[PDB]
Structures are given as C-alpha cells and as structure tokens.
Amino acid sequence: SVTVIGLGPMGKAMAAAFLEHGYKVTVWNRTSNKADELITKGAVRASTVHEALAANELVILSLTDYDAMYTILEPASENLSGKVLVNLSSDTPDKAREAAKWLANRGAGHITGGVQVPPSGISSTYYSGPKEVFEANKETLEVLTGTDYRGEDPGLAALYYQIQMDMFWTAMLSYLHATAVAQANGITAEQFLPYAAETMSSLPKFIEFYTPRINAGEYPGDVDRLAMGMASVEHVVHTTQDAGIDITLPTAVLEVFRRGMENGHAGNSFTSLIEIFKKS
Amino acid sequence: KSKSVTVIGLGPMGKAMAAAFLEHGYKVTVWNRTSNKADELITKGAVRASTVHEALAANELVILSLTDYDAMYTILEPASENLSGKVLVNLSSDTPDKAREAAKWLANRGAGHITGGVQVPPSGIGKPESSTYYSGPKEVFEANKETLEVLTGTDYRGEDPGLAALYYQIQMDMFWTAMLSYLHATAVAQANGITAEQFLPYAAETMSSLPKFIEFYTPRINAGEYPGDVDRLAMGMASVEHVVHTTQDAGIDITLPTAVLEVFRRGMENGHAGNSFTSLIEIFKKSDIRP
C-alpha cells in the first residue's frame, strides 16, 4: 500500500511507522546494501527500482539529495507514470521545483515535503505542490508526522524548511559562541543553561511584538533605538575579544548594525536592519 | 545604618531605582548633569545634590546608573577624594574587563564596590519578579543585599567583579545574533512572497524549541565531548550551504549566514567532520590556533 526509497535517518523512521499499520510496503536503497530487518514486519525489497516503483502508486523519496533522485529514477522513467512521488528533501526551493517538473514530464504526480524533525520525530511537515494530489494522500502522510500544506509552488515546502534552518543554525551558534565566552570567564555550560534557555524562550515575545510593524514596513524607535542596539553589540564584540574568543560571528552582527547606522536609521528600531538585508 | 541612598545617573533606569527607594522609605539624594531630569523625583521627596562632591558625601551607599564606565570616570574622577568608605553599585552594562578595572580603581580610592547587570527595563524595577546579576566581594554584597532587593531580586554570581557584566553580555550575544537571523529569515520569506505574519508561527516555534536542543547538548558540551551520534558537522555545513544558496536566490544579503558557514568551514578543516556540530565551540575557543 506504500513504498519507501532511501533507508536511513528519516527513511526507516518512516518504514517502521508504516509497516505498523498494514500497507504492502516495498523498499530499496541506493548503495543496494542490507538494512532489511524491516522484512520482519511485511516488506518486500525489489532487486531494482523498476519493480519497487510498479509495486504501489504512492512512493516516498528520502534521498541524500536531489542529484541522487535523477540517478536512480532515470533508468525507470517509463514507470514513474501514474505514480505519486512524495519527495522529502532538505534542498533549496529551485531544486525542488526543478525536480517537480522533471517528474511531471514523466506523467507522475508529486508532493514536495519539508520534514521539521529528526527521525525520532516520526511533529509537523511542510508540504507543497498540486493541492488535489496532496489532499488525496493526506491521511497516509499524517501517519508519519502532522501535515502543513503551504500552497501550490513545489518549492514552498523547501523554502519554509530553509528559513527555519536559517534561524536554527544562526541562533544555535550564537549559543555555542556565548558558551565559549562563558567558559573562558570560568562559568560552566551547566551553570549557563538556564540563562541561555530564558533568552531563547524570550524571543517569541519580541517576534510577536515586531511582526506587525515589520509587516507594515514601519520601524519607529519608540521602544528601542538602533544606536543603543549598536553600542550594545560593540560591548559584545569587546567582551568576546577580551575573553580570547573568535569574534567573526558577532562581528558579522556588528557589520549589519553599522550599515543601518550609515543609512540614517540610528533613531529607528533595530528591526529596520531588515532593510539592510534586502540590500537597500 | 539608616535608610538613605544616593543615585547617580538619572536616565530612565536611575529615575526608576530612585522612585523605588523613595516608595520604600529611603531618604534619596540624586545627581545628574542636566539638573531638571530630577524634577518629578524631587516632587516625590528626593533631594538633589547640586554637585558630585555633595552627592557622594550624602550617603555611604551610592547607586550608579551610567551609560558605561567611561561615564563613571568622567564624573567620579574629579571627586576621587570622597570615594573613601563608600560602597558604589555600578549598574551599567559594559564589558567584564571594564568592570574589573573599575572595581580596582574604586578600591584604590578606598571604596567598596558591587557590580550589577540589570535584566529588565526601567519599569520592571520594584517588582520582585525581576532579577539583577550582582558580582564582587561577597561580604560587601551580603551587607547590602536587603537594600538592593528594593529594586529587584538579586542573583549574586560570585567574587569576580566582572561576572555580572559577563552574564548580561552573553545573553546579548545570543539575543542580537538570534534576532538578526529572524530578520534575515523574514527578508528571505518576504522576497519569496510570504509575509511576516504568515512566517510568525514558524519563527516563534523555532526560537521556542531551542531550549530543548540546548538542554540536550549541555551535559556533553559541559564535559567537553562532541560525539556524532545524533548530528554530524559535515551534514550541518551542507545544511548551512543550502541556506546560503536560498538566501542568494532571493537576492538577500549573505553576510549573516556566510559568517555561520565560515565557522563550520574552520571545523571541517580541523578534522571534526564526524563530531557533533557543537564541537564548533572549540573553534570559538581557538583550540585550533597556537598559544
């Protein structure tokens, strides 16, 4: 009743939570190796993708990256036709929408997925692509994680994933950076934990407060001033240098502030720096 | 020890502290350069010292709320003589090293000293919910603990006079870096036609879920261990790479995410492909750079 391609991280995390409901579940892997214990739960494993495709209408693609998709599916392009391919990737929007057209030109349906959680979270997922084909396989997908359809463009699901990872990676390194500064001044990562937790848990309040102003393109400095912001970032950079810690991350922050100041925003809210990000 | 106090520095923060002390029965003397910024607090019972010398003579306990420590020397330097026997509380938000310097400068003029880092806007002063970092010699802080709880709860952090400023600065490190990544992410969203109100829910959950990741990694980081059992640096750099490619396809400035990518690059270069991405903390400590 379903097929999974790409046994691995999310891969089996999904195969497992499938055979645990009663679908005829086939499988297959790129390197063509083992990882087949799941044959103990009702899984056929074909000797090529030709059959693993002709097994079911639904197919889940959990590949390393999109380049690997063309490689294995091109041999069988004559059988992609009439299938619904759920492509779960971590790649850029343009690669998702390149991929979708490639699959549409073989007669297949497609859904682009942006998984929001490690395989342990097999909880929400981004989905984009043709609405009708998503609604038709909605319930099946809700087995893996919650579904959060974002619209028609096949790149929307990748896009939403990428801007979450933008924030995650940058905020998590600032936490590692802050922890380096802490240790060099003699406080442990364990003592710093509640303080790093409160800071990160306080940010939603600021986002909710600024969002409507950002939405309107307005940056009044009634509750904060870019200048005080900048002075404050300068204190962070000097704190870091005095501690003997690499300064490149906070310096990158200071540079965005500096550009805002020179564009005349000193009296505006620091949220005006989004204009600097838009290359104004 | 009567209930009297001096507040030097009368910007939004000093005015609140002074008002908090007045409403708790302290005789409060004040000083600021303007002279008019004290009008409202005087109508409420404060006494203005016309000069720094009188301000310092009025009390043993002196509360400083200044822009930074350069401001402290400008106004304290010409009265170095009346600093003896005084307990100065510096509630300004400068670097740890400037707090250590100022503590030694004060003790050399005979003054006890306490550093504080304030975690709240002026209007959170006088609420027990609020906290302030305090650091410096243990006994002087304990002898003044009660008075300082008029303003906020107190979180004494240790002997090193720099610790209060430190804890404040590294929460700034995270706050500004994390908020800018939100602005950066929003710009990318908007450039792809998705509004900030549409992104609000995802941006808030992403920041909301960080304490979970921080809690998970804390005991490993704390033990200097970075095994690759749940994440690999190499996979992380590839994810950062995707982010930069998305950002430049939107036409959005790449400064912020490429700085992030530089750190990952130094990590790969140093043989940590197979470690957790949290091993990037050694990169930050320049473990790879000769001492």
Side-chain angles (χ1 to χ4, degrees), chain A residues 17-277:
Chain A
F18 273 144
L19 270 181
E20 299 174 13
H21 299 90
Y23 310 100
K24 268 188 160 77
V25 170
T26 42
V27 289
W28 197 88
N29 192 40
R30 278 191 48 80
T31 50
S32 292
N33 289 337
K34 294 284 107 290
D36 47 312
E37 293 177 350
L38 248 169
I39 299 181
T40 64
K41 303 82 173 177
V44 169
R45 176 250 318 160
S47 46
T48 187
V49 289
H50 177 287
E51 278 162 15
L53 251 183
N56 309 304
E57 293 177 350
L58 196 59
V59 181
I60 310 285
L61 277 298
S62 198
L63 292 189
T64 61
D65 45 18
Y66 272 130
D67 276 322
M69 188 208 85
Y70 302 107
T71 311
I72 50 176
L73 263 52
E74 182 271 321
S77 75
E78 308 187 25
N79 280 1
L80 284 160
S81 182
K83 312 300 184 183
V84 177
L85 286 306
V86 186
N87 164 262
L88 285 299
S89 280
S90 40
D91 213 339
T92 75
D94 289 334
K95 304 302 183 176
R97 55 177 72 99
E98 168 173 42
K101 289 185 181 181
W102 190 90
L103 290 168
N105 284 336
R106 270 67 173 175
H110 55 267
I111 311 156
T112 302
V115 298
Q116 285 165 222
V117 300
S120 313
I122 307 293
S123 64
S124 184
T125 284
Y126 302 117
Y127 285 110
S128 65
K131 175 70 171 179
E132 188 154 276
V133 57
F134 163 71
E135 290 290 349
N137 299 258
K138 176 170 177 184
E139 297 168 307
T140 312
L141 293 172
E142 284 175 326
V143 174
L144 306 179
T145 83
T147 62
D148 181 357
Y149 179 81
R150 303 312 306 149
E152 300 98 325
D153 171 20
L156 274 171
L159 179 73
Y160 273 91
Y161 178 80
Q162 295 297 345
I163 64 182
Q164 279 192 338
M165 293 320 263
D166 192 7
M167 282 173 300
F168 173 90
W169 287 124
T170 305
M172 279 310 296
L173 267 68
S174 85
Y175 157 75
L176 301 171
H177 181 273
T179 298
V181 167
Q183 297 170 335
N185 290 265
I187 72 169
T188 68
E190 173 51 55
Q191 302 181 287
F192 180 42
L193 162 69
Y195 302 99
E198 47 161 315
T199 298
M200 297 298 96
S201 86
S202 77
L203 301 186
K205 170 177 67 163
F206 295 96
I207 293 172
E208 309 263 12
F209 172 84
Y210 282 120
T211 283
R213 301 172 170 208
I214 291 166
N215 194 65
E218 321 187 324
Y219 314 100
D222 53 322
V223 304
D224 70 293
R225 312 284 269 198
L226 178 63
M228 257 76 79
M230 182 148 72
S232 167
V233 174
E234 280 161 62
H235 289 345
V236 167
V237 178
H238 291 334
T239 297
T240 309
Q241 310 176 257
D242 301 333
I245 296 302
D246 187 81
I247 64 170
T248 59
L249 184 55
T251 292
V253 174
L254 173 50
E255 277 305 288
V256 180
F257 271 81
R258 186 199 44 87
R259 287 166 62 184
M261 293 284 294
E262 286 153 4
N263 205 3
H265 289 93
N268 293 119
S269 164
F270 87 95
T271 51
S272 67
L273 298 174
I274 193 173
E275 294 315 324
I276 299 306
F277 288 136

Side-chain angles (χ1 to χ4, degrees), chain B residues 240-256:
Chain B
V240 171
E241 266 162 355
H242 295 343
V243 169
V244 52
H245 295 26
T246 301
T247 304
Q248 53 185 183
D249 294 339
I252 296 310
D253 177 305
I254 55 169
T255 292
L256 196 41

